[PDB]
Amino acid sequence: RLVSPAYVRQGCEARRSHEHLIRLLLEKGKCPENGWDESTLELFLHELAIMDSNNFLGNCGVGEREGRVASALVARRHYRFIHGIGRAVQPKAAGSSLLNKITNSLVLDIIKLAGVHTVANCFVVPMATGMSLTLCFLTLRHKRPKAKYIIWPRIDQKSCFKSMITAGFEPVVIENVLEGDELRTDLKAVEAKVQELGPDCILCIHSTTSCFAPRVPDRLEELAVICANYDIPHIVNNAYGVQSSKCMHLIQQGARVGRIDAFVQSLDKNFMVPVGGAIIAGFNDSFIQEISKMYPGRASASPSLDVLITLLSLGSNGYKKLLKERKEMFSYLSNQIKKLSEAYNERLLHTPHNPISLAMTLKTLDEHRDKAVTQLGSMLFTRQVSGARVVPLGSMQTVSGYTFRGFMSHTNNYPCAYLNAASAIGMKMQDVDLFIKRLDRCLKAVRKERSKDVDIEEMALKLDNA
Amino acid sequence: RLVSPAYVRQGCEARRSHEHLIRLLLEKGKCPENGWDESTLELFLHELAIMDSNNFLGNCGVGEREGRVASALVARRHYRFIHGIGRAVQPKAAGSSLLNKITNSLVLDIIKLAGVHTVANCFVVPMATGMSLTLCFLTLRHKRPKAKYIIWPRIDQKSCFKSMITAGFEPVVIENVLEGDELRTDLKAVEAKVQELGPDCILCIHSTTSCFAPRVPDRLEELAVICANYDIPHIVNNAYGVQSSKCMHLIQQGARVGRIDAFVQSLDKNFMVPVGGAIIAGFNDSFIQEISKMYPGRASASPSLDVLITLLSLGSNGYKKLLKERKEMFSYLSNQIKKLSEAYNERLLHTPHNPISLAMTLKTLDEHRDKAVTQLGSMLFTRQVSGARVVPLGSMQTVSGYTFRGFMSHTNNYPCAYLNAASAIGMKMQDVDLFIKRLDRCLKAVRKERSKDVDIEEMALKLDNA
Amino acid sequence: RLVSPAYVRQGCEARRSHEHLIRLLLEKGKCPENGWDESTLELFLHELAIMDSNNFLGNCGVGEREGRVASALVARRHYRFIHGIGRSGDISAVQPKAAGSSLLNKITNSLVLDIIKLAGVHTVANCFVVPMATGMSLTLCFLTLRHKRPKAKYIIWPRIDQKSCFKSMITAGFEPVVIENVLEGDELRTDLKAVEAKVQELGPDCILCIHSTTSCFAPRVPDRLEELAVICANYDIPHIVNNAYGVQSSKCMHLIQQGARVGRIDAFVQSLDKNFMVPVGGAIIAGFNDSFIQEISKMYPGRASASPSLDVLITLLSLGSNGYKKLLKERKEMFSYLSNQIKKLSEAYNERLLHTPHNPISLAMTLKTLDEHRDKAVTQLGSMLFTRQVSGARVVPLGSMQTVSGYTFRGFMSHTNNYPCAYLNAASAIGMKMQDVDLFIKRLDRCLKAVRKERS
Amino acid sequence: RLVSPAYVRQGCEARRSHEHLIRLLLEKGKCPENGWDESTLELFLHELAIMDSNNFLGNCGVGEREGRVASALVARRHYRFIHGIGRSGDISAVQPKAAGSSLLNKITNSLVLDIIKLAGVHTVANCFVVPMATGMSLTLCFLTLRHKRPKAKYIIWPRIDQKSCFKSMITAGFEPVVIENVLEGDELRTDLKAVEAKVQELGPDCILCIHSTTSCFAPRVPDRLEELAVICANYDIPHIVNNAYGVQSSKCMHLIQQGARVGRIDAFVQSLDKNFMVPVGGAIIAGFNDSFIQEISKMYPGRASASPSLDVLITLLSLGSNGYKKLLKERKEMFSYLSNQIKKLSEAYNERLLHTPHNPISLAMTLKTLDEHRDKAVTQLGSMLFTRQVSGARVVPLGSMQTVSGYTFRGFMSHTNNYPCAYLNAASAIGMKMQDVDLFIKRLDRCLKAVRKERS
RNA sequence: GCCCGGAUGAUCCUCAGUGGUCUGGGGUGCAGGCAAACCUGUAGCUGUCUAGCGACAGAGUGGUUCAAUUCCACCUUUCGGGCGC
RNA sequence: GCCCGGAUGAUCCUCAGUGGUCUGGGGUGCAGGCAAACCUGUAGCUGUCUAGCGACAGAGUGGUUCAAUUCCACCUUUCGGGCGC
Ligand SMILES: *Cc1c(COP(=O)(O)O)cnc(C)c1O
Ligand SMILES: *Cc1c(COP(=O)(O)O)cnc(C)c1O
């Protein structure tokens, strides 16, 4: 095996083309335009992992947190990143620390590409959006120690509602105003509540962009002006709004004319990675760092690793293509539901200000007698349609002591029951066509039961009977 | 490929021996005594993953959280568990939900095996110990709304200290009492502070078991009696105490004679998995469930998956063997440091009540002139010794506004500077021998510089010069 | 935990849809039309591997071949298939020690037979994967024929300049009889009269077989299999076809099918890697006489690697027959695009595309305007394309001499002693993308510019 | 990000310790004494694979063998080594299209040569891995000898009842001359006078080689290689040694070394899976004449699979020479334990351990007290052990007849026509654990109890 | 290896009985009463903590019941019966 | 493919100049003044939002500087020079 020096030359020159892509990533911190090949990616990950002390060849550990791993399956599935992330001259996990920095720089680049070009700082946190919102509220407590209220335009979603209560504050629920079919921000009620309670007693205004139709993204510009005038922090729930240029442009415009202290988005919903992580972003770099420093102890590196792999494999061109296809799939889904609803004397709710979610009416379904609105949601489930959300009339729900009327509808008395469908990133035409086909069959069976492909149906009938 | 019915028979009978181990796990929820083979484990994981809707063959998704995965590397490294964990007749992630239940049952079994036999309930949370302690304090706020103080016997560790402040409470630092070389709980000062502030103003007493020598685990029994008498919650930081039968028995005895509302432990420190997760356990089942319900939104399944793989691969016998070896390695490390310290006129601090961590004095090192105590920590680092913690005299440190004197030493004026080493799970004899060998060389070079194996040293001298 | 009857039910319902696909594969042995999801595939492979005795839970081994694996990396990368395929006396016999590997082998051979029919040879009777490449697989065919024709010494072989298929005859222990090709236009084609003359000179009983070739580099074209098959049928001489990468060509496959219809074809051999985009190491031996194909299989001594069979099994189940058909359709489309791009580029440099309509895979462009005795440009062009990361382009100079196993070829790489000119080869093989052609055209354009500049 | 000069420095310092191990391997080609960590190994493999042209970033392919991979599962499980080993005319020649695979092949063969010396044949001159099992590898040896001895028709072969090594001679196209063994005590040993008599009867020029066997089932023992090597040297006859699983036996290896010292051994062949705990599919051909071993390698037509070479490379780098030595030492210890346990069990059932001290791997226990014409207990015992998940135990009955490739064996599996009794085989092969023997003893004890109960 | 029928686990040993705090038939050791005999009393193991003495707990895992050595399911061991490339 | 030397990116087109808000030498279109001519003025692209008009932003990515078309590093493109299983 005595190798020729040309072999060592060829072996060195072969690695240079890969190192060049790695050096460009490290120098400018931007997503590659075209995605890396898997070989470049895994070479990069292996070279980062060996920088952590637990992967040193001559390492000995006499501490209680040495990154020892009992299972080889566990070590390999994490690419030997064991020490997690957190934060100088004696780094125990220099590779994980570099992984954290690059990942945050890549996500910041995507956030600018997605529409918030003036974002100043962001970081990945391995908690989902709800806990990440809680961490924002926990940071604001020390800044506004006399504050106990969070003003919150109503959106029926348990995680973002619980985030305020888990943080130890009292939500002030601002009901929405019905304009046509849409539920929109009641700016008059928001400002009246600010004056009633007093700006010093308000921890922040907690607004939401991405949401289920017929709710639309909040009027962020007007809310940001209210927050700037009364010196009240503004925290935006942007859980799955990164994928929507409409939502991102609302955030940029809100920060331009007024105040947005932070906006939070889910990793899984915007980057097609496992549930578990989120991004906290903002326009004041010092404040965003303050939220980061509020986190006690080290944290999992697994969500950062997931989105690092994803963005390097997709590239900015790959992510742009997903954003374009999401818009095209939204138009296709909208046209298909419009065509289907006509056959059953239903209609697509008129919600032009919601760019992600759509709703079809269910007025022809008798829920009081036949409970067909509830039956529809079950039948769609047994036919393996996921994400189709059915909203009946008059649902009463208690969440952490607060009682919601008309729950899931974001208002006390919406005119009708309806069904939700959304065009989120990664959806294919097959998703739309199968959903339309199965929804058609479910509506037929509901109507047929009042007058008096195959294997999904055979198991559906058995589950429906059980 | 027309197969014989005997082939289908053989193929069915072959899987039965594996399914038998799986059924026993699901029926009784106990760790297997002997570890599963990898084939049984991966068959089990694959059968769980296909129960999640994102892995259904005929699934169509029209929602915003469908578990879509852009990168095949990401999907495979998580065994196709994408939906995370959280919490009925329409489960979107029935496989992940079963994974969560089994993992919590396995961890509960290990906690009983480790020494807390009367534990009633526990759950894995994908946050490290600091954030998990915060979640405990956040849960207690609603129970004791007039409380603002957390009484806390001092331990110099930034994560557990920050946990109280991030939760929005004011730590009341109780200084420790020096008994011989050991720093122990000042029970008189704890109770005097309870009476001074008033029990209703105390959110909880926050005690600690696992800690660096010369601090020892807190007097949990006496603290639990104080908590029971004054009706004050008791939260125990047991970050890496699961591996110590001494620590676990303190927790069981504390709950027997008094009150322990919850104890928290790190996943990585006690189970040799990546940093990122923790276990919250307790003796009141309803209260432990209350902490669980306080968490907003879904959470990462990756820490649960790691410890599930680990415990199924190790078995209870494998974990018991690691616990036994940790005790043997503690005696060996203690005897080796005792022998080395004699050669340099130092000594092993007398800390018999700390079963994990040890400390060797550094009295012969001149830190005021030569800064040799600080130099020692650097030299050990450059020689690739990790976890060796050097504690100089007179370190002043501010953490979230609070100023610590004598930081890292858990007291304002400890008699001497010292060096920490620990026998944690997974440590091998090689770790001890290499640490002893390199510490010997570092002490020689420090003393030699006052009078006036090879490649680790060559790089160490270069880093030491830089 | 508390596995309610719901979890037991849901776990069975979830496995049903995957097992439906598996059962359809086992009952009919056909390639799935649409490819399987990875989850179905890895579930299938895991359930196959657990059938092998080395993966049994309560197993104890007291033998010398227990399938023990020292490295976990080795075991996992092979999906725990350790025992190989076959038994000591037959690579097709079922191994009770390795029932899962035996099932893997049977399914794989059935999928491959299905593809061969889909690819164009609908009358194929039997085939099997062998974990040797095409040259060594041709040798196995010749080794099988020896006992049937004990007086045979020669193999009649229309010339094709490829060392492996030439050495296959010599390694088998026979003497190649090289039949020179006929220049018909720009194409090199079978000299049928010279083939029949050698049959009459040497004697049919002295000839082990006629060894013809379909897939080849332009300007050579597939052999005239129909006329060769008639010669073989008339003289009772076996006919072995080297079809190394002809599975991807419906024209090559139809030519094999037609030769078997009008005359005699005893076996045809094809490469796994060239036709199924898997690593090098395996081949397929196929034929129309079921018993004779089984004879070749039984000639193989001992067990053999399962790795090539596992690769094609994974590939075909993931692609599906629709996926493979799509790759075949795209190969034709890329052939037309590559040909048009070469024609366009050849105009700009006063060259031309050689007219080889009977070769559906390989193309040839003249290099007559390049001087090699003056500049050595023809020889340099090959290494210039290589340094610019163009792979697969053959530069064929004039008058190259090459000795292979004692036999001297004149005009090597050109399949004849004096082809009129030097030329460049490019091919449209399965898996090729439009970017492959565009980069090749751009980089070849830069190579020719540099040679002209270096002369001027 | 902000890769400070610290991160660039730390990244280079971290890679240094791993590259030190790699450079030590490349400069000397020796097995590391202590095994590599997985991180070092996978870093090495990844840097090798990126040297292959199919893994280049700016590559375009216009050929028919570009190493395209349709399935990502296939590409990853092979660490992106797609091109196989060798070239069209030589499996040892460097492939400029696959420089990484060529380097993998050279390193692997060097590691294997190092182990062969460590295992006991210190005078070995050359060896190479071939991705065929032992039987097919023996065939390649015989195929190489044909051109050197064109009049040769026969292979003289001391009988061993194993179908692969017997078929290897026939597949190569030669006639086996079966030499019956001599009963010496309980052992079956080489009949040297019958071997020399066949040499004189048939004529040395008519004999292709003498084909001897080391590793074998008791009561057969390794052949008398020293006396056979002298016979071959005196008559100028090649000597090919079947050493299928003898690498793990220092006594087998020393016997090969001594035969080469006093006489002639042209090549010895061993299985990869039986000696290195890797999947079935590869073998090692080794010898003492460097040029002749290279001749066998050059006889192989075409490229070949890299998968067996990758498996042994991973295994040997992970084990280290210390790891392999430890497995060899444990095999001897397990042999003594298995033998003592069999002796103890054989006492309880009025049986005995056959005295076969010259076989260091395989053991044989009598089954004379079992009646087969009355109860068919001997035949049933085999399937009884199988149903209790005992693998590798050979039950050898009396008077079994078996036809292999037209040749009829009498007393098959027993290596002689009339061995005095039926017996049971068990072996201590590398990787065996104490649990293997204890489970075997317990389950065999239960089988014998059931047979006696069924009779009574 | 699996299916099926039993027994089996951890209160000195055994053998019976018993849903009610266990029982009594033989023994063994220790200890006393009056050398077999014989009467009366007594009894072991594991983990953790502790310098110790001792202290906290365990009776295969769970279930039912006010109450389980007793009844139920599973597991461990073992005895049966059956299946035998 | 790589190393090296330049130029190059996104204000009508070009060609020069310029660290100072750009310049002027030729042209083109549009628009007026007095058919070549000729004078004066004017100018494009992308993303997002919007029924629209329009509105918010972008000049390759960053750096230096009070200030960058100008200077620096890298990237894109391209022209050179060199390297050729
Ligand atoms: C293993 C073995 C062989 C070779 O068998 P293959 O399946 O070809 O590898 C030959 N002879 C003996 C004695 C063997 O044990
Ligand atoms: C591929 C090929 C062969 C076989 O080459 P191997 O390396 O043995 O697979 C034979 N003839 C031709 C024309 C080929 O293209």
Residue numbers in the entry:
A (entry chain A), B (entry chain A): 11 to 97, 103 to 467, 478 to 491
C (entry chain B), D (entry chain B): 11 to 466
What does the paper say about this structure?
O-Phosphoseryl-tRNASec selenium transferase (SepSecS) catalyzes the terminal step of selenocysteine (Sec) synthesis in archaea and eukaryotes. PSTK first activates the hydroxyl leaving group of Ser by ATP-dependent phosphorylation, and then SepSecS exchanges the phosphoryl group for SeH in a reaction dependent on mono-selenophosphate and a pyridoxal phosphate (PLP) co-factor. Whereas SelA is a functional homodecamer that binds up to 10 tRNASec molecules, SepSecS is a tetramer. Despite possessing four equivalent tRNA-binding and active sites, SepSecS only acts on up to two tRNASec molecules at a time, leading to a half-sites occupancy.
Crystals of holo SepSecS diffracted to 2.25 Å, whereas the native and SeMet binary complex crystals diffracted to 2.32 and 2.07 Å resolution, respectively. In contrast, the complex crystals obtained from MPD-containing buffers consistently yielded well-defined reflections in higher resolution shells, thus permitting SAD phasing experiments. Experimental SAD phases showed strong peaks in the anomalous difference maps, which allowed positioning of Se atoms in SepSecS and provided an additional layer of confidence for structural analysis. By contrast, the isomorphous SeMet-SepSecS•tRNASec complex structure, obtained under low-citrate concentrations, harbored active sites devoid of large anions. Remarkably, while the P-loops are ordered in the catalytic protomer, they are disordered in the non-catalytic protomer, presumably adopting two or more conformations. Structural superimposition of SepSecS tetramers derived from our structures yielded RMSD values within ∼0.4 Å, establishing that human SepSecS adopted the same quaternary structure in all crystal forms. In the new complex structures, we could trace the protein backbone out to Arg11, thus adding seven residues to the previously visualized protein register. Importantly, in the non-catalytic protomer, a turn of N-terminal α1 (residues 18–20) unwinds and the segment encompassing residues 11–20 assumes a coiled conformation. The extreme N-terminus folds upwards and away from the active site entrance. Given its proximity to the CCA-end of the bound tRNASec, the structural adjustment and movement of the extreme N-terminus may help the aminoacylated tRNASec substrate access the active site of the neighboring catalytic protomer.
